[PDB]
């Protein structure tokens, strides 16, 4: 981690100190080099405890002339890579190219440096510990620094361009996965022009992505539009409006298992949804939503709503009988107990209940069999934690399916307590009905906002109801355990004391007040303190902070709804059969450029 | 104060009026000087009732030529300082240097002015009455005005640079304690270059601060970064990212009693926390919080929370017995009285209560013995009033410790009434659990905000509940003291009338309404007026004003949380023993610049 790298760099500078040749390479004394390379008895493979050579030290400090004296002294010093643990394959050519030193890279290439050296150490692998990820070929280093003359010089003596890293990423993948500059686009055009002809544009990595798909996933909209300029084809410019024929071979991907749309909307990176605002794909996903996705989603929502009315009606009509044993007990009310299963179904209305309960359990197993391969296909933490893919709605529909299957289990095996899974099944399924509210323009963004307020604001005052109401319910319990709980049984015992203080803390019950009897003077001052620092201070501060966080979230919230409609369009596709979703676009074997399906857009510009 | 200075300046101008020589020095008549200095019988030590000399008057109005005629008349006039009460040591050299008059300071230095004159009056001491604090040496005046040629001229004829004021501040301290300019930095470099070698950089004042520490305390981030440029040491610039080896001798201060971090975060000045955003100290305190401060704080959170569950459980299980004397009284309920101490502990569960009560009282004395030297070390008003150091949380934990010790006292001495200290002990300790909630990213800033809303907004409507509900409870008491309290005992008597109007003013109880009987016509119109100007007007205006003050406070609130995590990092350090906190950084005896501990940072720039 950080301290290990600090220890490595400290040991590196210690080994710069104790060896005088590395000191002379550092400070450019220009005397001690001549004596310590004038002799020929000792081999000049002097390395540090880190493992770098002296030519690495000469390249490291932009020291050209001293490095010319070392390459005069030994030609083989550019040949060997460093034997370090973080720098396990870094040669002096890498330091030469990444410092953009022209005479140094010319001289090192003239003496015969290794043009293909895989620097596969931990300090050069893609990691959040490293500030940059530039690959490990010198070609990738020259491509990342943007210097066109150096990468031209490296191509003109070798450096095959389709060389990959340990992650399978080619050099164009490393051009994608960068902070965006205006200096990385025209030299990407240079690298595409040097391809000279399977191609470099369509090579995948070990992650399974094309450079186009990595442009989609990583949120690079500039290179997305710039590479869209190659696939596009204009038609005519008859007037101010022009026509444009975009290509959807790698966008829609009708014959591919991993669709590009599923990779762009289900991305961990935040910027990928901005690619959803670009005109070659926004019009495609809007046409797919308007023509097909919205009415099939409305039919699916209506079928789910009628299924939930059927489950609720079969839930209210649960079989009950009168309580056989007498109560003989105050502070205890039950009047209706649950019938046994063998005596449950004896009437015609029991069969009417039974057919709808079978519809309920078959709807549950359809939900389970439809959702379980989506857990087993997508990464499960990525499937569950992402709010874009309906992750919370997926875990509450699976909790609903689990508790209704548990309800079926404890109905087949006669034992009391179906209220315990069944009430949670009712409330979780009816809160899972809000999953089908994202297809509507008015209901959807509010559902996004309540998902953000559940995931961001609810736990903050779960942990700040509890810290207040524990002490205040304990205070009310102490001031009221010396009194009669017959006339005021508000804080009679501790769980009802916490539950009463929780109710009154949200002001959903009246404060306890009795005027036929007297109350202790401790209760009045403790209750007054509770009414000050509980119901005036906290909830009005949520009015303030929920207003402020809604003002902060709303602008990206609307575009987040416009991303979840894309997710609903794609995930609602490829689950329903292929006959009911035709391939969108037009057949392209009439224009004159192949057999690839296209999308035509009208665009009235300035 | 202000009016005393007005009287001094009025008496000064009166003594300018009555003496014609000072008038001739003012308006440049160039005649009356020649007659009134042509004679030699009278000594020219004519001073005002304020006490300034005539050469002070000649320097005061940028009057060079008249001052040349006075120094031709008398050479000794530059020697004597003014004998004033506010200007007790101000010489004419001071007026010459602070007006930036080049020929005047050249002529006054040529005639032999006192280059070291301590002007230790009340008008030149550091005070909020004075608009400026420029020191009292002429060197400090030349240093404050920024004129490099004048301070060069003052050094070239004397003016030893390490001269201090009455507060012990040297000249570099006066360069720190200024409004920030771009004109005070390069001439601070000039004064550092004129130091020519213990040094002026490390000399302290009577307040005990280095110029670096005074740069930290006073909020001068520009000179902090500028003086950090001297301590820093780069390593290499291999690529776009560079390494930087900062020095932490005077920052972390492992061997110093008064740490620089404790002086910068516990500062009365607002701007000092902006120094907490600078990269040589932000990375250090973030590494100290992430590596060590956060898990020890979480272990302290778990220990304090389990201790409070133990105290609450031993509080609920308080020993009680049935009431021995009969009640014989309506409007009076008690059923359980407190047992005596000799009959309190007779069961095994009483021993289970007793061991947790001992854990409670030893936790109280650990809290007291841990916090009392922090009162006796830090300034007590500065320790108590500061929200950065957890001042309100400290006074509520000490109120908790005092009332639980009082509860132990009235348990050892048998007397009734443990509910009154014990309920406040419960609520104050459980509200003091929120002191440990600032180490989390989500809970912390909300705790900052509720601290600000107690300290700024809660008294504003303590004094505006009371002014409304006193008159309205009196109105309800007048309209309901002529009626039967059996049918409606809401406002039966005046303390219950105020408490009922206080409850209904926050709408935590229902309005009193009876329909089996009749209510007076006055109550309906008074209650309608209360419902208009009490629950619609006020509490919605706290919605509005709390939203507005949240939008004003939030931006500096988040950085205030990022400062209080620094305060918790430093204060949580040096209280636990030294073996649990290793010295942060790396040992610097391998680079080549000494035996001082360093901090290494990676910085990827543009």
Swiss-Prot record, chains A, B:
Description of post-translational modifications: Glycosylated.
Extracellular side of membrane: 317-353, 411-416
Glycan-modified residues: 326
Catalyzed reactions: Ca(2+)(in) = Ca(2+)(out)
Repeat positions for ANK: 16-46, 50-79, 88-117, 134-163, 167-197, 207-236
Result of changing residue 393 to A: Decreased inhibition by the synthetic drug econazole
Effect of residue 518 to A: Minor effects on Ca(2+) permeation
Regulation affecting activity: Activated by WNK3.
Annotated protein name in UniProt: Transient receptor potential cation channel subfamily V member 5
Native source species: Oryctolagus cuniculus
